[PDB]
Amino acid sequence: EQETRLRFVSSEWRSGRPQPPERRIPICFPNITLQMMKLTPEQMDQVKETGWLREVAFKTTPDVTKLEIAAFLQSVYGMNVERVSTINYLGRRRLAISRNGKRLWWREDDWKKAYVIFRPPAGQEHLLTRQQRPVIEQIREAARAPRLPPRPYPWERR
């Protein structure tokens, strides 16, 4: 089966600067994958009714674009996307010690994490849903606070 080719750093350096295509076709049969991560249970109850959150984070593949995630969410799931922020992650290293001790090492496939900021759909904008105290008192209280303890060592008992 045809799969991921090896790439070479000198080859991408020499044959550099990918050019934009001359024509872009509307994408029938798209191949694009998104998944949410874990939500807080109160956020899960926030999604169970009325289906909305201000900030949702997604796992995607690293060959996507902020424009593609925004266009896909707006086109398919009917959302209003305000901004997308993308982070490229390496896969996790995995260790799966063998019948003779070898230290078999794996690497998960690289993924891109998108932070999508949403917008209230139509007329429902009330669900942004949030006395005073002086900031001089805040800083003066946070300056007389006890310091954080130094981090214990993994063999150290406290």
Partner 1 sequence: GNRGNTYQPSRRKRVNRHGLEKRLSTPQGREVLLRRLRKGRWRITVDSFR
Partner 2 sequence: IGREAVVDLIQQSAAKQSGIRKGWQVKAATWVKRVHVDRGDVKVGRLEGGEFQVLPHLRPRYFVPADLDKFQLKPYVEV
Say how many CA atoms lie within 13 Å of 100 toward its Cβ.
Answer: 1
Q: Which does 140 bind (CB under 5 to 8 A by kind): partner 1, RNA, partner 2, none?
A: none
For 45, counting Cβ atoms within 10 Å of its Cβ (0-12 exposed, 13-18 middle, 19+ buried), the class is: exposed
Minimum separation from the CB atom of position 61 to RNA (A): 10
Contacts with RNA by CB under 7 A: the residue count is 49
Minimum separation from the CB atom of position 4 to partner 2 (A): 7
Distance CA 40, CA 47 (A): 11
Nearer to RNA, 29 or 155 (CB): 155
Beta strands at 55-60 and 111-118: parallel, antiparallel or unpaired = antiparallel
Site residues (vs partner 2, CB under 8 A): 3-7, 9, 12-13, 16, 18-21, 23-24, 26-28, 30, 62-65, 67-68, 71-72, 75-76, 88, 90-91, 93, 104-110
